[PDB]
Amino acid sequence: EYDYLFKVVLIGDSGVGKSNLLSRFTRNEFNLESKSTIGVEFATRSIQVDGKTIKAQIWDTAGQERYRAITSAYYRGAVGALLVYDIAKHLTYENVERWLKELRDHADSNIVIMLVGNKSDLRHLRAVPTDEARAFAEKNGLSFIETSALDSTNVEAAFQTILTEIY
Amino acid sequence: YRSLTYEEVLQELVKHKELLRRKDTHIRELEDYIDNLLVRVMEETPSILRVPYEPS
Ligand SMILES: Nc1nc2c(ncn2[C@@H]2O[C@H](COP(=O)(O)OP(=O)(O)NP(=O)(O)O)[C@@H](O)[C@H]2O)c(=O)[nH]1
Ligand SMILES: [Mg+2]
C-alpha cells in the first residue's frame, strides 16, 4: 500500500513531451516516434519521498485543445499539475499563461503547479531562456525545472518535487 | 496525372477539398464521441483508463 495517493495531471501544448515524461517516470521508457495522445489515460508509480510512500496517479491527455468535455473530470481531485512547455519552441512557452488560466478556471485553488521546460537536450535549438521562464514561475508562485524525457535529466526530480510539495 | 487538362485538375482539386472537409468533420465526430464516452468512464470506472490495464 502507501501513505498517500496523489492524483497529478500533465498539461501543456501538444508535442511538448507530456506522454514521454509520463513513460520515463513510470517505466524509464522513452519513444522518439510518439504520436499525439488519443483520449485520456493514467499510469501509476509508487515512490519513497521524505520517508513516506506515495502512490502517484499521473494522468495524461493531448494538449491540442485547452478545454474539452473531459476537462473537469481530468482536473477533479488533482492535487498536482505539471505544466509543460518545449524549451525549443517559444510558442509552447507563450501558451503557458493560457494553460495557467485553464487551471485557475477548472482545478482546485490549492493545486500545486510545477512549470516544466522539457527537451533540455535540444541545447542548440533553445528558444526559451531558463532565466526568462524561472522569472515567470517565481512571479506566479510556481516551482520550476528543466527536463529532458529523452536523456532523462530531472524527470524524477520534477515529479519528486511536486509530490513533495503536496503534503 | 499529366494526362488531365487544366480544367480537369481544377475539378479534382475541388473534389478533394470537399472530401477533406468531410474527413475533418468525421474526425471531430470521433473525437467528440471519445470525449463524451470518457467523461462517463472517468466518473464511473476510471480504472479502465489505467496503463497497464488491470480488469476488476
Ligand atoms: N529531443 C526531445 N524530444 C522529446 C522529448 N520529450 C519528448 N520528445 C519528443 O517530442 C514529440 C512529442 O512527444 P509527446 O510526449 O508525444 O508529446 P505530448 O505532449 O504527449 N503530445 P500530445 O499532447 O499531443 O499527446 C515526440 O517525437 C517525442 O519523442 C525530450 O525531452 N527531448
Ligand atoms: Mg501525449
Side-chain angles (χ1 to χ4, degrees), chain A, chain B residues 2-56:
Chain A
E1 188 95 333
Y2 49 81
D3 301 313
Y4 298 88
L5 215 202
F6 292 155
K7 178 179 170 180
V8 181
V9 295
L10 308 175
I11 65 157
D13 280 10
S14 183
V16 301
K18 294 182 299 302
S19 296
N20 275 284
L21 286 170
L22 178 55
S23 59
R24 178 65 77 176
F25 177 63
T26 60
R27 309 189 284 283
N28 203 14
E29 293 157 6
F30 174 77
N31 183 12
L32 196 55
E33 301 320 320
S34 59
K35 286 179 152 171
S36 186
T37 298
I38 301 168
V40 176
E41 68 186 53
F42 72 97
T44 62
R45 177 173 174 195
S46 290
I47 60 120
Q48 291 294 49
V49 150
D50 261 84
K52 301 300 181 182
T53 162
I54 301 98
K55 190 161 177 180
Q57 195 182 81
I58 315 293
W59 291 70
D60 191 22
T61 191
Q64 229 163 76
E65 288 173 20
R66 280 157 192 169
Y67 184 80
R68 289 147 63 194
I70 55 76
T71 296
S72 301
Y74 187 73
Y75 287 133
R76 193 169 304 134
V79 288
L82 298 189
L83 169 34
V84 187
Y85 66 96
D86 181 346
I87 64 98
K89 296 285 178 62
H90 194 89
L91 179 54
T92 68
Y93 175 71
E94 295 167 39
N95 286 331
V96 166
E97 60 172 344
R98 311 305 181 204
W99 288 111
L100 258 181
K101 209 215 166 214
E102 206 68 26
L103 261 79
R104 284 194 235 106
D105 284 346
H106 299 115
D108 175 334
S109 38
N110 258 1
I111 193 169
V112 178
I113 306 155
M114 162 119 246
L115 182 62
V116 183
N118 189 46
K119 314 203 188 171
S120 64
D121 55 287
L122 301 173
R123 296 171 224 302
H124 224 264
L125 302 178
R126 171 182 294 276
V128 184
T130 302
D131 288 331
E132 196 192 340
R134 175 209 44 157
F136 175 81
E138 281 166 2
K139 165 169 89 62
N140 287 95
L142 314 171
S143 286
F144 171 70
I145 197 162
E146 289 193 355
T147 59
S148 177
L150 188 148
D151 74 32
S152 300
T153 304
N154 282 344
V155 176
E156 281 189 303
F159 284 101
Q160 281 179 358
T161 298
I162 199 182
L163 290 170
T164 273
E165 296 184 350
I166 284 155
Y167 52 24
Chain B
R2 284 178 179 279
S3 54
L4 302 179
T5 65
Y6 185 78
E7 294 292 339
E8 291 177 337
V9 291
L10 244 52
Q11 57 171 31
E12 281 286 294
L13 190 63
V14 156
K15 170 170 94 183
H16 294 49
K17 254 115 69 47
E18 176 70 15
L19 188 63
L20 185 129
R21 178 171 84 242
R22 289 205 281 108
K23 286 184 191 307
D24 282 335
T25 292
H26 190 217
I27 289 165
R28 293 202 302 287
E29 289 172 334
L30 291 167
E31 287 170 341
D32 287 353
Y33 174 86
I34 285 169
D35 279 4
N36 292 329
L37 177 58
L38 283 169
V39 169
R40 323 229 284 224
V41 173
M42 289 170 74
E43 290 180 340
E44 199 94 45
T45 319
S47 62
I48 287 172
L49 303 178
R50 183 178 180 166
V51 179
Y53 169 63
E54 47 173 341
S56 267

